[PDB]
Amino acid sequence: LSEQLKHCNGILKELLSKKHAAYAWPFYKPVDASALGLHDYHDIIKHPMDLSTVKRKMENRDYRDAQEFAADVRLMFSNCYKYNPPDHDVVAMARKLQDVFEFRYAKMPD
């Protein structure tokens, strides 16, 4: 599972790469609810998550296994699906980035 954590890190790097930037960018940094006018965001979302936070946790060796890492990535998408009207542009972007994630996560080495 050092090997599994390296697969996870590879996924993370891909998610942050220019390849996916057109739909990944809203996930780069924590949602700035204040800035955006989303004054209910932190009443609705108990545990914010974003790719910069996942990167910091990987860098700090916070994740002890692939499943812990995946839980944070899925939390980030679930927060998006919870908060937003399902026709919002950001939800379309979340679906696309999550397709990238789930297909490559599935290729995890034993």
Ligand X SMILES: COc1cc(OC)c2c(=O)[nH]c(-c3cc(C)c(OCCO)c(C)c3)nc2c1
In whole angstroms, the minimum distance from the beta carbon of 61 to ligand X comes to 26
Q: Closest residue (Cβ) to ligand X?
A: 26
**Sign of torsion over alpha carbons 29, 9, 95, 19:** positive
CB of 57 to ligand X, least distance (A): 17
- The only residue of 2, 18, 37, 110 in contact with ligand X, by rule CB under 6 A: 37
d(CA 42, CA 44): 5
The contacts of residue 42 (CB under 8 Å, 6+ apart) are: 33, 48
4/84 with CB nearer ligand X:
84
* Maximum separation of any 2 CA atoms in the chain, in Å: 44
Q: How distant is the alpha carbon of residue 15 from its chain centre?
A: 8
Q: Could you tell me the smallest distance in angstroms from the CB atom of residue 107 to ligand X? A: 25
- What is the contact surface with ligand X in residues (CB under 6 A)? 26-27, 31, 36-38, 80, 83-85, 88, 90
